[PDB]
């Protein structure tokens, strides 16, 4: 009845699930797309095809296949990001909660996760919709899209792997909740799509690319944006890193046709297990496969799509976290540590500095040395720890996005920015890496409500206020309730954002000005002059 | 006989002249070398050849050609610097001050006026030896060298007129002093050369060059030193300045001899008027006739001399001032100006870096102005005028001294670094001109001994305390006497250097390092790329 709707693929009956000594709808699993499997790996996705019956939508889809991380087993930081379902190339699905009871026309916000275009799920606790959905009477959608080879191959000319697949998953899923949502009381015209890390760049990829302009009316874009160095490649890089997959595996590299023959031939974790070495430079925060910038999902460049006002005109509201470097460094860079304040020698520093920039020549390496260096207390093993960290968020994640506010907000129609500098009191991490990348969707997704987590009562307090923040932008465009302290427009003159913590809201002007100046006009013109 | 001498040369009579409620002895305006005039002119100089009869040494001398500073007429801070007796070719003299009685063989100093090589006097009443001598019983000399194009103008490969002839003068002198101021009671074993810009410069030009090494037994170089990017050029800037030098004035051109018989038969006031017009570039801190690296006077690059220790091995103390680069953007950069706070707007701060750093390319004024723009508070125009300030100071004087200090004391034996930041309570300059280049000089000759000048009894006792120092350090290698606070020795490792002002000393270590590792190691690597 509430749990039995009929859309337009066919009927789907969800779950009556528990939150927050209520409850609400749950509908888990609901196909929007054909499985892309066989003959269909690296193609675009396909309509799901109507079903006769009752499709079962009380669990969790399967995840899609990726590269699982087991540098810390069994450790919940990094275990709380990998799938949690079964893995298979069969995971084209979404997931809806609606609050109960439903609701006639509410505002949808679409949830697109992350995870650097190689890895991902919809079904991390992190990302549950329920106490959203409940506590903001919003109807909340995850969708879910493939990563790594399998969604991002490109070999531009060929419709068999024409790279980007994975984007037109998420672009068939919005097509989905457009055509279906108002049979879940949702109201497809006020729909906003919200994603972390890559899927902040995917929102943001969605608003330039023409065929996804009429499917969302507005976007939050959390740690990433899609300018950023590791969200997009040329067509010809692609191409390179697929012929290299080929030639990791053996297969035949005389014609795409024979390359995607061969990779359709493999397991999908034989793939996986090669992904790593398509990569041209040692790096951390670089991904394989991730979109290609193919004169179709993107007509032009990036940066002249962003000069010229090519993209949709709506309000956007989008951020960045203190310390978005940290666990990258974790993972790749020497003399870092989990278990240790991994204080950083000034010989690490300098292999750091060059595996995050693994771009730049030698001059452009000395420019970000001497931008991040203290030269009275260059052996300070702190400093040069921080000094590190904030390179690889500077120029992996803040510093693109302030390029992208800024362009966008020339010719948008209202920009929200935030600076998220929380550190959760039940943070399993050590206190040198920070806030965290990805350590705000706990927040965003009402987590400290639930007394079982064991955050403080300021933290329950701080994910209300974002919660409404992030609901109230979706259903109005502004963050603010109208009458009482306000959030301002960012605007080109002033440059205002607000602090996102556990204290009464300050305003700042100039996120990161001076780092992203060189980030975005310094250091670029040098590696094209020299 | 106290005042009769006979020397190498022939018999001088000296002054008895007042100092400080006592008497010393002056020898005013002694030949040290034929006049260079006729064909003489931009030769190396010429013993003079002895006299008979009494020369009468109780004048100051005629001073050398040069450019007259007209820009403020009639005022004192800008008077104060330029030539106070008739100038004339005839201008090859020197001046010595001897405690009376006359001592035994007591510590030579021999003085070299700066002035950008192209302007100075032996004569000025900040360079009055007679306080120093009588104060700490030292033999004062101050010599004089031809300046500009008569000193400078540099055909390489012409014996006429082959370049670096001031450099000689200074150099003769240094060899009279040796031959004859034991006649006045000095010790030739014992001399100390120092000067202060230009002058400082030339100090370190004397410890570089083979010729000079064997005349002189310590050094001080004063806000100058011999790396300094306005102190020298190649042979081939030295010859286009000439050539240049000749068009201005319809010169045939066709060879160096037909070149400098066109400039030999010319007043010299027509050279005057036209040395400004053979600079390549609109600039400040640039000066058109300055030393040439020759492969005679310096048999190599500074750089490698300076990284092979081919250089005289000794003492050295030496230092620089707040504000060094002040008074040259009041000279020559807009917005600037001696009756008002001098307030920079941002256009008048990017004209000012172009003029400070003339020999920079695009990608390197932005380097410039990225390091020393607030870009929190990019419209502040007392951040701009400041940041303009150390622009000119840290490029032209500062950097190139830590560069020369950092080289010289791994192979020296004892380096005594200094930070001057006292403004003088009696200064005609306005307040954001600072701590001013050349401003430290009336400290090191005593002048707030006298109490007609109405600088405060904190600032003669900081007097005092800086000619003891020069002194002692002139005498013994060390300003310290064993004995009591201790200024310590510059070290390789440590790098420390004292403040001198009126409070009590502070020792602190890396000299401005930030700003001149931009302008010793990366800027330079910048400007040599593609
Ligand atoms: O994995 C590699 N590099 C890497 C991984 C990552 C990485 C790891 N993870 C784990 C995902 N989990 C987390 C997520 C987020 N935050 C986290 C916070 C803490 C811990 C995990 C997190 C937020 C966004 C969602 C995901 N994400 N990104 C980032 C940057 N570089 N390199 C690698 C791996 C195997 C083999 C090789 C390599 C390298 C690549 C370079 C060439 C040579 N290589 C290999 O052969
Ligand atoms: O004079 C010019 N520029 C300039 C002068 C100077 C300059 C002037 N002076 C006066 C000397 N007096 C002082 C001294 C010192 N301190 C002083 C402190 C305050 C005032 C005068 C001082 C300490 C060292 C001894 C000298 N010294 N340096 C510094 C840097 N640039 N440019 C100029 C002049 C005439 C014509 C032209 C130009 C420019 C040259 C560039 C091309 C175009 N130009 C001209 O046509
Ligand atoms: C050397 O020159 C000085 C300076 O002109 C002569 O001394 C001046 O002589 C006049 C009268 O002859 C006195 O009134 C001044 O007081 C003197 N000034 C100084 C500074 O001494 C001196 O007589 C000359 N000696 C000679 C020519 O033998
Ligand atoms: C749907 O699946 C769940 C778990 O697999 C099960 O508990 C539920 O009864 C199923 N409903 C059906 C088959 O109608
Ligand atoms: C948004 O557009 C409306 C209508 O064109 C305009 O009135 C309003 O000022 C705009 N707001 C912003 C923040 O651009
Ligand atoms: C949460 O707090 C309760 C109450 O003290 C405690 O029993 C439980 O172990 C805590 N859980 C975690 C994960 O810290
Ligand atoms: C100076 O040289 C002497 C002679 O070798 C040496 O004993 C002394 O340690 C040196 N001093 C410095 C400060 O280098
Ligand atoms: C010194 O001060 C006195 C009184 O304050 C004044 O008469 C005299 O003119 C001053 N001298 C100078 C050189 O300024
Ligand atoms: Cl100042």
Chains 1, 2 share one sequence.
């Not at 306000?486 to 009464?504: G, R, S, V, Y």
Request: charged residues 20%.
């Amino acid at each position: 009845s509430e749990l039995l709707v009929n859309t337009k693929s066919g009927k789907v009956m969800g779950t009556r699930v528990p939150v927050l000594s209520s409850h609400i709808s749950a509908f888990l699993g609901i196909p929007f797309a054909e499985p892309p499997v066989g003959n269909m790996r690296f193609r675009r996705p396909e309509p799901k095809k109507p079903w006769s019956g009752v499709w079962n939508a009380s669990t969790y889809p399967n995840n899609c296949q990726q590269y699982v991380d087991e540098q810390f087993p069994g450790f919940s930081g990094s275990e709380m990001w990998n799938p949690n379902r079964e893995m298979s190339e069969d995971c084209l699905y979404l997931n809806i909660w609606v609050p109960s009871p439903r609701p006639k026309s509410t505002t949808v916000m679409v949830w697109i996760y992350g995870g650097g275009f190689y890895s991902g799920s919809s079904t991390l606790d992190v990302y549950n919709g329920k106490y959203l959905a409940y506590t903001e009477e919003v109807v909340l959608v995850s969708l879910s899209y493939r990563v790594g080879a399998f969604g991002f191959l490109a070999l531009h000319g060929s419709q068999e792997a024409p790279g980007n697949v994975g984007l037109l998953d998420q672009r068939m899923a919005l097509q989905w909740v457009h055509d279906n949502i108002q049979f879940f009381g949702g109201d497809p015209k006020t729909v906003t799509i919200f994603g972390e890390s890559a899927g902040g760049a995917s929102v943001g990829m969605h608003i330039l690319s023409p065929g996804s302009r009429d499917l969302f009316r507005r976007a939050i874009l959390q740690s990433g944006s899609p300018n950023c160095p590791w969200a997009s490649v040329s067509v010809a890089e692609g191409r390179r890193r697929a012929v290299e997959l080929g030639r990791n595996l053996n297969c035949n590299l005389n014609s795409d046709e024979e390359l995607i023959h061969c990779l359709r031939e493999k397991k999908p974790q034989e793939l996986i297990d090669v992904e790593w070495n398509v990569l041209p430079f040692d790096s951390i925060f670089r991904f394989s496969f991730v979109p290609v910038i193919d004169g179709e999902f993107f007509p032009t460049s990036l940066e002249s799509m962003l000069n010229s006002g090519n993209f949709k005109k709506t309000q956007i509201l989008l951020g960045v976290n203190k310390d978005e470097g940290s666990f990258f460094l974790l993972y790749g860079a020497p003399g870092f540590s989990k278990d240790s304040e991994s204080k950083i020698s000034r010989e690490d520093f300098m292999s750091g500095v060059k595996l995050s920039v693994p771009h730049a020549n030698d001059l452009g390496l000395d420019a970000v040395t001497l931008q991040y260096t203290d030269w009275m207390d260059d052996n300070n093993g702190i400093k040069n720890r921080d000094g590190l960290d904030d390179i690889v968020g500077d120029h992996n994640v803040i510093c693109p996005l302030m390029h992208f506010v800024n362009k966008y907000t020339k010719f948008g129609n209202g920009t929200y920015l935030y600076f998220f500098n929380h550190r959760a009191s039940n943070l399993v991490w050590p206190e040198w890496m920070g806030v965290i990348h990805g350590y705000e969707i706990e927040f965003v997704f009402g987590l400290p409500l639930v007394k079982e987590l064991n955050y403080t009562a300021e933290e329950e307090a701080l994910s209300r206020r974002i919660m409404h923040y992030w609901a109230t932008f979706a259903k109005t465009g502004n963050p603010n309730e109208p009458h009482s302290s306000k959030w301002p427009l960012f605007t080109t003159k002033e440059q205002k954002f607000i602090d996102l913590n556990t204290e009464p809201m300050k305003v700042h002007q100039r996120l990161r000005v001076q780092m992203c100046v060189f980030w975005n006009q310094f250091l670029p013109k040098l590696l094209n002059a020299t």
